[PDB]
Write a protein that binds this ligand. Structure first.
Ligand SMILES: O=C1OCCN1CCNc1ncnc2[nH]c3cc(F)ccc3c12
Ligand SMILES: [Cl-]
Length: 167
């Protein structure tokens, strides 16, 4: 039993809810919140800009130190950093940006990072401002993630279509 409330069960391990991941993280304080990161951990907009704003820019400060030490992430890769006031940990995961022609096959590699964590709150990787089809992102998630994932979807319209087209 866990504290994730009001989710619609899609599969054995995947659950979905119309919610802003930021507000959902603030309420649940999950062990792991997933950020829809880019390789530079520049959290300007989308999930990343919104999470970072909710941390009062502390996520960005921590991220800049991470990049200065380690260099950029890989597309499809991830790193674990602090969850600040939102979660214990933040798993920064880089899905491909389709608007720049990055290989959508890397979306599966991106979701594989979730399997290193038993339970996660997460957005749809590569959806929204990253330019991929959110229906496809959900399909890859369900077919790749084996650990327990709670997907927060911001747009009510999008949430209802993702549910409706699933089975
Ligand atoms: O649902 C969706 O509609 C448009 C894209 N998208 C899926 C990807 N985005 C999100 N996913 C989940 N929570 C979010 N909170 C946010 C707060 C923001 F300021 C910006 C973006 C999000 C967001
Ligand atoms: Cl977005």
């Amino acid at each position: 039993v866990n504290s994730f409330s009001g989710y619609l069960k899609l599969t054995d391990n995947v659950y979905i809810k119309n919610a802003d991941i930021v507000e959902e993280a603030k309420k649940v304080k999950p062990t792991v919140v997933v950020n829809a990161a880019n390789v530079y951990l520049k959290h300007g907009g989308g999930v990343a800009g919104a999470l970072n704003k909710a941390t009062n820019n502390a996520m960005q400060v921590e991220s800049d130190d991470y990049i200065a030490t380690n260099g950029p992430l890989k597309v499809g890769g991830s790193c674990v950093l602090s969850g600040h006031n939102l979660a214990k940990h933040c798993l920064h995961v880089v899905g491909p940006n389709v608007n720049k022609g990055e290989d959508i096959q890397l979306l599966k590699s991106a979701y594989e990072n979730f399997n290193q964590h038993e339970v996660l709150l997460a957005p749809l990787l590569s959806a929204g401002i990253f330019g991929a089809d959110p229906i496809h992102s959900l399909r890859v998630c369900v077919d790749t993630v084996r650990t327990n994932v709670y997907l927060a979807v911001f747009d009510k319209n999008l949430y209802d279509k993702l549910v409706s087209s699933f089975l």
